[PDB]
RNA sequence: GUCGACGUACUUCAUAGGAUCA
RNA sequence: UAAUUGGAAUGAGUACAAUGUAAAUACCUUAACGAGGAACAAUUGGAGGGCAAGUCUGGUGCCAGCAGCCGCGGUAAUUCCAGCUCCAAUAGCGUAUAUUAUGUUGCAGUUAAAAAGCUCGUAGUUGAACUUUGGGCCCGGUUGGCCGGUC
């Protein structure tokens, strides 16, 4: 059955932006989907989006704008130490200075070049480029 | 039969090098996830100056929007853009004319046919991505 | 000029993880702890015989 | 997903699954069970002794023909009798009958104009001395 | 016993396609 | 291309001696000797070339093929590829046997390796969303720019 809700969300965005649509509807929406999306939004990969509220898990509607090449999830949330940041970003990005690996640290959900500055690490969620 | 060439040494190729990229060097770089500038540093162990020709850039722009990440990689600011005095023709032909007219570039490419036609010309080393990195063939200053 | 297509048969009991039990015993269990040393010393002592 | 598990608590499953499906790889079961050498002709060994049982082609007119160069040799470990090449056809005078030839694999990389399928060994040392040291006339054969 | 079922080891059969020329 | 010859150079070796060392030996140093084929005589492998009043095989002639250390004389005599040409590594070089360049990352299962006939099911792995969010004030770190007071 349904296990990763974030994987469903990123796969629905990915499919419905490959084919050229303009706004996407993704049901359910945890706190993690909001924070992962705010990280994608800060860097310009998606437009605004909005959480519509039933009295249930809740749905989101995202406004895409083209600039997104791929996004995904890394499915066992592997613990990542502080050198393994750079082994991870060499495995899953097509050129080692664009795209952001996104990871869950004790100081928030953030990309990797923000977790370099603050000197933290944590688990690993996904990626965008 | 230029004044630099030995029997087959070709000693006008020296650090820092100048490589010419083909259109399917970029594809297999994106596929095997090596990076252009540091990949050539990690094989040649010298500085590099990747160059891309107007015929090749036209070919990249001809692919379309499914291959737009490779185009994003090719418009990168530190890949210089050598301009070429051509009608505007097939890429591999423009590479061969560059090689014959100056004999001081090494050629990074991956198609077998262009590999053969370069190999006839004596003294032109020939990088190509294989496996996991940028293997170089006919360069006598390796290690 | 009608040729039918070959039905590719399905094997019987001859599978590389079932061959290992066909002799007296379970042959996976009589092994060593260092095959490299077994090989180099076995060869040398063969030559010294 | 794919066929395999991926959750972060299934190393035991992955480790056992590799430990079973690894005995189905012929080099693994070959090198742990210790079967690895009945492929090789000699036993485990790299050379093998033998008795010169007789010569072949000693009455063959056509000189330097391969069947002129081959002797027929009984091995002392098994008891099985094989055929063996000999370099430099003049060196058929050195082996007589009941010598101890020490044979090595012939291991030829390629096959020539008039060669033989079937000779697989070659004679290295004849009764202690070595055929390069008799043919070069360094030593001589101690009877 | 030129015996059977296996288990090892090895051998061998299947390679040309297009274009131009005569 | 060299195949004669002109003097200069030196240590392998031998050695008074001193040094070394427990004692020697050797190294380091050094009188005296010590280089023309510098006979003070580098090697291990593989590729080619020719060798006829020779042998052997086959054939649609004088040929071809194998091969050629075997021919007519001659071995204190023949003084012959002076003693055939290249190639690679070189105080090192060759041959045999092995071995080396299963999928976490990262494999494959319609049609040519391999989805159990079927469902139930314990261990095992795995499992929806939700609980402090947000604002306001102050403090300054460490950069970057205008700066460079300086001898
Ligand atoms: Mg099948
Ligand atoms: Mg259960
Ligand atoms: Mg949950
Ligand atoms: Zn051009």
Swiss-Prot record, chain A:
GO terms for cellular component: cytosol; cytosolic small ribosomal subunit. Its main location: cytoplasm. This is Small ribosomal subunit protein uS8A. NCBIfam families: PRK04034.1. InterPro entries: Ribosomal_uS8, Ribosomal_uS8_CS, Ribosomal_uS8_sf. Keywords: Cytoplasm, Ribonucleoprotein, Ribosomal protein. Belongs to the universal ribosomal protein uS8 family. Component of the small ribosomal subunit (SSU). Mature yeast ribosomes consist of a small (40S) and a large (60S) subunit. The 40S small subunit contains 1 molecule of ribosomal RNA (18S rRNA) and 33 different proteins (encoded by 57 genes). The large 60S subunit contains 3 rRNA molecules (25S, 5.8S and 5S rRNA) and 46 different proteins (encoded by 81 genes). GO terms for molecular function: structural constituent of ribosome. The keyword Metal-binding does not apply. It is found in: Cytoplasm. The keyword Ribonucleoprotein applies. Gene3D superfamilies: 3.30.1370.30, 3.30.1490.10. Pfam families: Ribosomal_S8. Component of the ribosome, a large ribonucleoprotein complex responsible for the synthesis of proteins in the cell. The small ribosomal subunit (SSU) binds messenger RNAs (mRNAs) and translates the encoded message by selecting cognate aminoacyl-transfer RNA (tRNA) molecules. The large subunit (LSU) contains the ribosomal catalytic site termed the peptidyl transferase center (PTC), which catalyzes the formation of peptide bonds, thereby polymerizing the amino acids delivered by tRNAs into a polypeptide chain. PANTHER family: 40S RIBOSOMAL PROTEIN S15A.
UniProtKB/Swiss-Prot annotation, chain B:
Its main location: nucleus. Keywords: Nucleus, Ribosome biogenesis, rRNA processing. One of its GO terms (cellular component) is nucleolus. Residues 17-116 form the PINc domain. GO terms for biological process: endonucleolytic cleavage in 5'-ETS of tricistronic rRNA transcript (SSU-rRNA, 5.8S rRNA, LSU-rRNA); endonucleolytic cleavage in ITS1 to separate SSU-rRNA from 5.8S rRNA and LSU-rRNA from tricistronic rRNA transcript (SSU-rRNA, 5.8S rRNA, LSU-rRNA); endonucleolytic cleavage to generate mature 5'-end of SSU-rRNA from (SSU-rRNA, 5.8S rRNA, LSU-rRNA); maturation of SSU-rRNA. GO terms for molecular function: RNA endonuclease activity. It is found in: Nucleus, Nucleolus. Disulfide bonds: none annotated. Essential protein involved in pre-rRNA processing and 40S ribosomal subunit assembly. Required for the early cleavage steps of 35S rRNA at the A(0), A(1), and A(2) sites. Interacts with FAF1. Belongs to the UTP23/FCF1 family. FCF1 subfamily. This is rRNA-processing protein FCF1. It comes from Saccharomyces cerevisiae (strain ATCC 204508 / S288c). The gene is FCF1.
Curated annotation (Swiss-Prot), chain C:
Residues 1-22 have a biased composition (Basic residues). It is found in: Cytoplasm; Nucleus, Nucleolus. It comes from the Eukaryota. Residues 1-38 are annotated as: Disordered. Transmembrane segments: none annotated. Interacts directly with RCL1 and the U3 snoRNA to form a stable subcomplex. Component of the 90S small subunit processome also known as 90S pre-ribosome that consists of the 35S pre-rRNA, early-associating ribosomal proteins most of which are part of the small ribosomal subunit, the U3 snoRNA and associated proteins. GTPase required for synthesis of 40S ribosomal subunits and for processing the 35S pre-rRNA at sites A0, A1, and A2. Controls access of pre-ribosomal RNA intermediates to RCL1 during ribosome biogenesis by binding of RCL1 in a GTP-dependent manner and, via its affinity to U3 snoRNA, delivering it to pre-ribosomes. GTP-binding and/or GTP hydrolysis may induce conformational rearrangements within the BMS1-RCL1 complex allowing the interaction of RCL1 with its RNA substrate. Required for RCL1 import into the nucleus. Belongs to the TRAFAC class translation factor GTPase superfamily. Bms1-like GTPase family. BMS1 subfamily. This is Ribosome biogenesis protein BMS1. It comes from Saccharomyces cerevisiae (strain ATCC 204508 / S288c). The gene is BMS1. The chain holds residues 2 to 50 of 1183 of the full protein.
Swiss-Prot record, chain D:
Present with 10600 molecules/cell in log phase SD medium. GO terms for molecular function: structural constituent of ribosome. The modification 3,4-dihydroxyproline is found at residue 63. InterPro entries: NA-bd_OB-fold, Ribosomal_uS12, Ribosomal_uS12_euk/arc. SUPFAM superfamilies: Nucleic acid-binding proteins. Gene3D superfamilies: Nucleic acid-binding proteins (2.40.50.140). GO terms for biological process: maintenance of translational fidelity; maturation of SSU-rRNA from tricistronic rRNA transcript (SSU-rRNA, 5.8S rRNA, LSU-rRNA); regulation of translational fidelity; translation. Hydroxylation at Pro-63 affects translation termination efficiency. The stereochemistry of the 3,4-dihydroxyproline has not yet been determined. Keywords: Cytoplasm, Hydroxylation, Isopeptide bond, Ribonucleoprotein, Ribosomal protein, Ubl conjugation. It is found in: Cytoplasm. This is Small ribosomal subunit protein uS12A. The gene is RPS23A. One of its GO terms (cellular component) is cytosolic small ribosomal subunit. There is a cross-link at residue 55 (Glycyl lysine isopeptide (Lys-Gly) (interchain with G-Cter in ubiquitin)). Belongs to the universal ribosomal protein uS12 family. Its main location: cytoplasm. Disulfide bonds: none annotated. Component of the small ribosomal subunit (SSU). Mature yeast ribosomes consist of a small (40S) and a large (60S) subunit. The 40S small subunit contains 1 molecule of ribosomal RNA (18S rRNA) and 33 different proteins (encoded by 57 genes). The large 60S subunit contains 3 rRNA molecules (25S, 5.8S and 5S rRNA) and 46 different proteins (encoded by 81 genes). Changing residue 63 to A: Lethal mutation. Pfam families: Ribosom_S12_S23.
């Amino acid at each position: 059955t349904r296990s990763s809700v974030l994987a469903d969300a990123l796969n629905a965005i990915n499919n419905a932006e490959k084919t050229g649509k303009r706004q996407v509807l993704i049901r359910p929406s945890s706190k993690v989907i909001i924070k992962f999306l705010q990280v994608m939004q800060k860097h310009g990969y998606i437009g605004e989006f909005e959480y519509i509220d039933d009295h249930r898990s809740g749905k989101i509607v995202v406004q895409l704008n083209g600039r997104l090449n791929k996004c995904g999830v890394i499915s066992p949330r592997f613990n990542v130490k502080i050198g393994d940041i750079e082994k991870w970003t060499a495995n899953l990005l097509p050129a080692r200075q664009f795209g952001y690996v996104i990871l869950t640290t004790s100081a928030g959900i953030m990309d990797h070049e923000e977790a370099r500055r603050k000197h933290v690490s944590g688990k690993i969620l996904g990626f965008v480029y | 039969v230029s004044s630099a060439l030995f029997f087959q040494y070709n000693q006008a190729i020296k650090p820092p090098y100048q490589v010419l990229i083909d259109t399917n060097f970029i594809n297999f770089s994106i596929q095997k996830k090596v990076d252009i500038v540091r990949g050539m540093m990690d094989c040649l162990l010298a500085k590099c100056n990747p160059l891309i020709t107007d015929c090749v850039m036209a070919e990249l722009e001809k692919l379309g929007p499914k291959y737009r990440i490779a185009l994003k990689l090719a418009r990168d600011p530190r890949i210089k853009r050598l301009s070429c005095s051509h009608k505007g023709t097939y890429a591999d032909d423009c590479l061969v004319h560059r090689v014959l007219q100056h004999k001081c570039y090494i050629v990074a490419t991956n198609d077998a046919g262009l590999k053969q036609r370069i190999r006839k010309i004596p003294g032109i080393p020939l990088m190509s991505v294989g496996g996991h990195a940028y293997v170089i063939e006919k360069l006598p200053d390796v290690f | 000029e009608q040729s039918n297509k070959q039905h590719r048969k399905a094997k019987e009991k001859n599978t590389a993880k079932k061959k290992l039990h066909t002799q007296g015993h379970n042959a996976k269990a009589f092994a060593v702890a260092a095959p490299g040393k077994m090989a180099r010393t076995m060869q040398r002592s063969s030559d010294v015989n | 997903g794919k066929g395999k598990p991926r959750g972060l608590n299934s190393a035991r499953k992955l480790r056992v699954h590799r430990r079973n499906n690894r005995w189905a790889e012929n080099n693994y079961k070959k090198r742990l069970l210790g079967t690895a050498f009945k492929s090789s002709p000699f036993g485990g060994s790299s050379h093998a002794k033998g008795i010169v049982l007789e010569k072949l082609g000693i009455e063959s007119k056509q000189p330097n023909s391969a069947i002129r160069k081959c002797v027929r040799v009984q091995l002392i470990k098994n008891g099985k009798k094989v055929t063996a090449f000999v370099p430099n056809d003049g060196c058929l005078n050195f082996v007589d009958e009941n010598d101890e030839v020490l044979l090595a694999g012939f291991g030829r990389k390629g096959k020539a104009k008039g060669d033989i399928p079937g000779v697989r060994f070659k004679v290295v040392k004849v009764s202690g001395v070595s055929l390069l040291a008799l043919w070069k006339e360094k030593k001589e054969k101690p009877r």
